Amino acid sequence: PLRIIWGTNVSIQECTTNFRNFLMSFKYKFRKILDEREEFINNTTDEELYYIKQLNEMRELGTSNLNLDARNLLAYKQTEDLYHQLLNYPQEVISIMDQTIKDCMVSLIVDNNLDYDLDEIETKFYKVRPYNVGSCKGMRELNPNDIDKLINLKGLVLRSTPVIPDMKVAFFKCNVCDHTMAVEIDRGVIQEPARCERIDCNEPNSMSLIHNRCSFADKQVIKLQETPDFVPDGQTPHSISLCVYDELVDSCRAGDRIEVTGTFRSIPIRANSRQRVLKSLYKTYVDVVHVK
Amino acid sequence: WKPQELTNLDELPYPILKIGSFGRCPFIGDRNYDESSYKRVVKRYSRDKANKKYALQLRALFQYHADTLLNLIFIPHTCNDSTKSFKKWMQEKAGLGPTRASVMSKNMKSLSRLMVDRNSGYCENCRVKYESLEQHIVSEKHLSFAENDLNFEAIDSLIENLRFQ
Amino acid sequence: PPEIKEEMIQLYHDLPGIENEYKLIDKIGEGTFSSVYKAKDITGKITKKFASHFWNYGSNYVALKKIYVTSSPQRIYNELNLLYIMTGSSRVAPLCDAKRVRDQVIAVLPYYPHEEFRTFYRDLPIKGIKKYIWELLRALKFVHSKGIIHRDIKPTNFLFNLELGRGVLVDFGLAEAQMDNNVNGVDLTKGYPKNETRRIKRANRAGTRGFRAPEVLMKCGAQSTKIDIWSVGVILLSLLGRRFPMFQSLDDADSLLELCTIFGWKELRKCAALHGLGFEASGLIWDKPNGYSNGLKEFVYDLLNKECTIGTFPEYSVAFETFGFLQQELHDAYELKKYQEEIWSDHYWCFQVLEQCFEMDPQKRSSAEDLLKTPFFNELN
Numbered sequence A: 001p002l003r004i005i006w007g008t009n010v011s012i013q014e015c016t017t018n019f020r021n022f023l024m025s026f027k028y029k030f031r032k033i034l035d036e037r038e039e040f041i042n043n044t045t046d047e048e049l050y051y052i053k054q055l056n057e058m059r060e061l062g063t064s065n066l067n068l069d070a071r072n073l074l075a076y077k078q079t080e081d082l083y084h085q086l087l088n089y090p091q092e093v094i095s096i097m098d099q100t101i102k103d104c105m106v107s108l109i110v111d112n113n114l115d116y117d118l119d120e121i122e123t124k125f126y127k128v129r130p131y132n133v134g135s136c137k138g139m140r141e142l143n144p145n146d147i148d149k150l151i152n153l154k155g156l157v158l159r160s161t162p163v164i165p166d167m168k169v170a171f172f173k174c175n176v177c178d179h180t181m182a183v184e185i186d187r188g189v190i191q192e193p194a195r196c197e198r199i200d201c202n203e204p205n206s207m208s209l210i211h212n213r214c215s216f217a218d219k220q221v222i223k224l225q226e227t228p229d230f231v232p233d234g235q236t237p238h239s240i241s242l243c244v245y246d247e248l249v250d251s252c253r254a255g256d257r258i259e260v261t262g263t264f265r266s267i268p269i270r271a272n273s274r275q276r277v278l279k280s281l282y283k284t285y286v287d288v289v290h291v292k
Numbered sequence B: 001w002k003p004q005e006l007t008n009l010d011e012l013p014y015p016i017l018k019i020g021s022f023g024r025c026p027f028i029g030d031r032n033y034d035e036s037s038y039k040r041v042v043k044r045y046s047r048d049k050a051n052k053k054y055a056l057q058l059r060a061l062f063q064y065h066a067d068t069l070l071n072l073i074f075i076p077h078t079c080n081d082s083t084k085s086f087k088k089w090m091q092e093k094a095g096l097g098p099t100r101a102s103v104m105s106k107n108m109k110s111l112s113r114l115m116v117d118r119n120s121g122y123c124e125n126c127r128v129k130y131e132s133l134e135q136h137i138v139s140e141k142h143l144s145f146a147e148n149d150l151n152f153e154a155i156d157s158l159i160e161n162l163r164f165q
Numbered sequence C: 001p002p003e004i005k006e007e008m009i010q011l012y013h014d015l016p017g018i019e020n021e022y023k024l025i026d027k028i029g030e031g032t033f034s035s036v037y038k039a040k041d042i043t044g045k046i047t048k049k050f051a052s053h054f055w056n057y058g059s060n061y062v063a064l065k066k067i068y069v070t071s072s073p074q075r076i077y078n079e080l081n082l083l084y085i086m087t088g089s090s091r092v093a094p095l096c097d098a099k100r101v102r103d104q105v106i107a108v109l110p111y112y113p114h115e116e117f118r119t120f121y122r123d124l125p126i127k128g129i130k131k132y133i134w135e136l137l138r139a140l141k142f143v144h145s146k147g148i149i150h151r152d153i154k155p156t157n158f159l160f161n162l163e164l165g166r167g168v169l170v171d172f173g174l175a176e177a178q179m180d181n182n183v184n185g186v187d188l189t190k191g192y193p194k195n196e197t198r199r200i201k202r203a204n205r206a207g208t209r210g211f212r213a214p215e216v217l218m219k220c221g222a223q224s225t226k227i228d229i230w231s232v233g234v235i236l237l238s239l240l241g242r243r244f245p246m247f248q249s250l251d252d253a254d255s256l257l258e259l260c261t262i263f264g265w266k267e268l269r270k271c272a273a274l275h276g277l278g279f280e281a282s283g284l285i286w287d288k289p290n291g292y293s294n295g296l297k298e299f300v301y302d303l304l305n306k307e308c309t310i311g312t313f314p315e316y317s318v319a320f321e322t323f324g325f326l327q328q329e330l331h332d333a334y335e336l337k338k339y340q341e342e343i344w345s346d347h348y349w350c351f352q353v354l355e356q357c358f359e360m361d362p363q364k365r366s367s368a369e370d371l372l373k374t375p376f377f378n379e380l381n
């Protein structure tokens, strides 16, 4: 029948078809009707296909990012389920959205027979930035059932750490035969080789990690002073830590008022440097998807 | 294929030439039922009775000329027949689809390992899949496409030409 | 008309002018991208202009082709343009008129009476095959001179009437026209990368299942005219083989292995070599390890042998002459001897011309005009 990812209610095929239909058939007049604004509907802008022309100008400019309004998913009838699936399961639904955006970029020149080459588009890795995901409920009013959900937050940036290299591919070299392998990171863990991969050289513990040949990515930590819309009785303001990655690094400066939409994350923190013992109480942070 | 997948000698992922009988495709064959059964022979003989009269004009039209430029002679055969087998049994008794990107993503392939279990077609004018055609007819994009005439202009010119031919 | 009458009245609401212009009787055929109806000509200049396209059967019925709105208008314009440019011979079925409303379009064609093909092949004689193949090759070489590739030749597309013995072609909706080393390491010939970054070539894959040319299966960038001639060869082999759905493809690679189990792994590797890609098969137990080096004779021989020795085959000697014929090749009344020598000669000839009709290389594969001048088709000239 139909397959569902374990732990979720998300189907790759169903979400892909629904978001493809949404991208092909959305008009901003739907957003006007949803926000109860009938008198402001105009012919020349609202009745034009919004994401079609946005993906077209994305193709002309070389842009690889789509800024998606989550309220627009509620404007469309077929994606009202998908909206909730974007809020509850951002990690795979965002990947589904990126894959179908790539499919749409291929389709807009396959169907219409444009002169753009397919190699440059299919080499590019398109990714989506959902924003306006809902009401800006506070950090301290969130619960552990909100882990790995999409959250929208107000704030003021106080400071940012320098550019931190987080290691994506690892480069190991043999000491005796100079044979090297590259291993990808898998959920934060790199498998170092016990034996040399060569058939001729199989010496144990001969693989050493060369830290400058292995590839890194950008990771930055920003301390954000939150300004909630609603503040409970005697709540004293706090600072959150938000992690930005890749392109979003150094996009927020100290002292600006920003709109962060991201993923509510929790990790265990080691009690001591020498020991692998973790603390039962978890540390919460925001994995940032989009900054307004 | 892993050897566990191909273990079966009846169902195979790749096509095998098992031939078959009674006008069926040679690759699927006759796995569901056999034509050697008596009852199958009876129904085939009953259809054969109907087919004699139909086959007589078929033989008579092309006996000597391919064209209609025109009682019948037929080659004897040593091999058996459906009627002789019937006689022996009596002696015993007595979609266009949407185009998609070539390359998939690593996160997309990682999600295949996490999946468990719980009329329709594709419109290229709107470039969307639909659950039912009659629901796709009543939709803002299809009706907005219908009221526009600037995208059938070539058609229009052809219509005009074909009006005064 | 239990439920289809509501579709007739619905079509009547669909077009406001068809009531004054046509009266429609029945539904004749259902397709994938169209549904065709039989209609009365009533009054009209189109019937008087064409006249000769209608047969000697008379009464001048007119086919009415309704196209679903899901089809792209570019393909519709391509199809109607290709029908209107061509005209000429009777086998191409030129269109009379086109009726269009705001979303749907009606194509009007002369109706050609015929019967369904599931009735032909089980009992149709070799002379009928001669007339059938002759009509298809005349129509195909006609559309070749016009420069149109059909890529949709199927028994349902071809219309043939027995008592008159002639044919006509429809369904040019998927047709179009065409106008025109070693690096160390990375031995990709033994395996594929885990993550793919290179693209897949954008072919013109648009045929029907089981009739798609082997060049189309391998997605050749420069696609020739010769899909149609291999397809008419496939129809020829289905007629001689007495099996209708002889090629059925679950997917593309299924069809590649379907070609493998008759012609051989080595034969398709040489066919693949000229196209620039190499094909390897490891394991893959089947009957004939190198295919049939003799050709298609022994394959269709034991193909008929299985269904003959089972005994479900019908009693008519229309398809028993081939079993005797193939039996004497594999083993090795005076008017009866005359019928012998005639059927023997041209029935050897049809298999002979079949092997050139099934050639892998398109450049070595002879064109339909060369197929007409073969000694096999002598009496029709």
Ligand SMILES: Nc1ncnc2c1ncn2[C@@H]1O[C@H](COP(=O)(O)OP(=O)(O)OP(O)(O)=S)[C@@H](O)[C@H]1O
Pocket: C028, C029, C030, C031, C032, C033, C034, C035, C036, C063, C093, C109, C110, C111, C112, C113, C114, C152, C156, C157, C159, C170, C171, C172, C173, C174
């Ligand atoms: N003029 C005609 N006379 C008799 N039968 C016809 C005629 N035109 C079409 N048919 C029948 O209609 C069917 C063929 O329709 P198609 O043209 O193949 O429809 P379709 O292929 O689904 O749409 P396409 O490929 O986009 S043109 C067969 O059953 C034919 O017998």
Ligand SMILES: [Zn+2]
Pocket: A174, A175, A176, A177, A178, A179, A196, A197, A198, A201, A202, A203, A206
């Ligand atoms: Zn080594």
Ligand SMILES: [Zn+2]
Pocket: B123, B124, B125, B126, B127, B136, B141, B142, C069, C070
């Ligand atoms: Zn549509």
